[PDB]
Amino acid sequence: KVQTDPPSVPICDLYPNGVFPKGQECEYPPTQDGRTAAWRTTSEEKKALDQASEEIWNDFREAAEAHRQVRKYVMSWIKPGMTMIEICEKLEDCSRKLIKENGLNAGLAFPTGCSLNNCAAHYTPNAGDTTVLQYDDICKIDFGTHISGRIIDCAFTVTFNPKYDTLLKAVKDATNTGIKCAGIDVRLCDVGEAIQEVMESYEVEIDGKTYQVKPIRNLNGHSIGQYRIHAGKTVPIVKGGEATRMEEGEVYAIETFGSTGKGVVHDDMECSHYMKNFDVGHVPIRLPRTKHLLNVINENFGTLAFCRRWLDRLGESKYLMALKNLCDLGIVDPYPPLCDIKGSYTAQFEHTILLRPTCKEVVSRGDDY
Ligand SMILES: COc1ccc(Cn2nnc3c2[C@](C)(O)CC[C@@H]3OC(=O)NC(C)C)cc1
Numbered sequence: 001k002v003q004t005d006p007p008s009v010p011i012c013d014l015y016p017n018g019v020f021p022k023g024q025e026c027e028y029p030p031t032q033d034g035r036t037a038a039w040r041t042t043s044e045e046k047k048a049l050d051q052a053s054e055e056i057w058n059d060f061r062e063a064a065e066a067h068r069q070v071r072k073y074v075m076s077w078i079k080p081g082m083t084m085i086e087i088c089e090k091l092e093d094c095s096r097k098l099i100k101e102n103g104l105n106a107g108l109a110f111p112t113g114c115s116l117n118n119c120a121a122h123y124t125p126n127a128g129d130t131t132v133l134q135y136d137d138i139c140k141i142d143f144g145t146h147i148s149g150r151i152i153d154c155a156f157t158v159t160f161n162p163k164y165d166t167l168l169k170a171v172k173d174a175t176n177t178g179i180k181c182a183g184i185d186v187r188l189c190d191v192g193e194a195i196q197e198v199m200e201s202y203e204v205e206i207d208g209k210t211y212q213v214k215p216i217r218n219l220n221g222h223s224i225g226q227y228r229i230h231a232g233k234t235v236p237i238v239k240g241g242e243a244t245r246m247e248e249g250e251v252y253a254i255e256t257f258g259s260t261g262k263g264v265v266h267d268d269m270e271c272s273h274y275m276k277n278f279d280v281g282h283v284p285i286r287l288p289r290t291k292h293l294l295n296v297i298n299e300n301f302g303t304l305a306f307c308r309r310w311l312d313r314l315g316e317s318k319y320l321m322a323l324k325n326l327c328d329l330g331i332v333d334p335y336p337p338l339c340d341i342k343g344s345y346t347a348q349f350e351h352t353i354l355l356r357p358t359c360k361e362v363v364s365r366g367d368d369y
């Protein structure tokens with residue numbers, strides 16, 4: 001089985017042995033002390049511990065190969081003139097095929113972010129959004145795939161005007177720097193300091209104005225858990241964070257955001273993204289529309305994120321009040337778009353990394369980024 005063009009063959013059918021490709025494997029960084037981590041590549045106890053979780057790494061890899069193949073395809077056709085709805089639907093149709101969507105066992109982990117310009121994250125269109133992608137837009141494509149709740153969170157920035165090339169380079173190099181700094185026993189604050197030093201080493205000129213690239217101080221990366229996009233540890237992108245350490249076996253989304261604005265986001269625009277609170281249990285609901293919607297969410301999404309378009313496509317309509325009810329009850333949380341000031345430009349790059357016992361794997365690395 002070879003992949004089609006456009007892609008249509010599930011990743012699982014491309015690897016008939018069930019063994020998916022590794023991402024980029026890295027020796028961990030040396031410690032402050034100067035000692036190397038070459039020993040892990042080998043310490044017998046570590047190779048056995050690594051191999052004990054092989055089925056888990058393999059699930060991440062299948063999801064990452066889906067991510068690589070979807071994003072390559074997206075880059076081939078994403079163009080100004082398309083609506084944001086057209087972009088997201090075309091991306092998602094392919095993602096569903098290549099992940100071999102199967103309820104909660106394999107699917108889309110969260111909505112397709114396509115945040116534009118001063119909006120940095122958490123924008124995807126709702127029904128009726130007429131927004132059209134423009135030549136001068138700076139669009140963050142952030143989409144997730146999962147196999148058995150093993151989530152790939154990985155993102156890149158699309159542009160068409162070369163004026164943004166150095167801003168993209170800055171943020172890419174900052175994200176790569178974060179990825180290199182990361183490791184077992186590494187302090188999360190140190191990762192933030194390193195990212196911020198790289199990002200701020202860049203100056204850019206856009207339409208005759210100069211800027212020093214600012215990390216967006218109130219955005220961050222995050223640990224990832226099973227069916228849990230944000231498992232509760234934050235990876236800062238500026239100095240001054242927590243000295244909490246990264247641990248063996250954790251998984252992290254190492255994302256950085258750069259801006260030519262204030263370097264701070266606020267909530268703006270209509271909300272599209274929602275997710276069940278992971279920590280809320282069963283709550284009996286008698287209100288019939290509210291009950292029905294929560295059942296739909298439990299069946300289709302569980303604790304994974306969703307958006308309004310994804311309810312629409314299941315045949316739900318006139319659900320907004322019931323969705324507001326679930327938010328007000330604290331069962332569902334809303335995740336509105338996050339924007340810097342009007343006229344600013346924001347960029348993002350992101351990978352998922354596995355802190356395996358024998359090495360650090362940038363599982364979502366491709367030949368693209
Ligand atoms: C509903 O769909 C999702 C999808 C991903 C996430 C995961 N997430 N959690 N926080 C953030 C993210 C994003 C979407 O990665 C972007 C970064 C943002 O950092 C942030 O807000 N930091 C403040 C809390 C200080 C959440 C919900």
Ligand SMILES: [Co+2]
Pocket residue numbers: 142143153154155253255350
């Ligand atoms: Co992301």
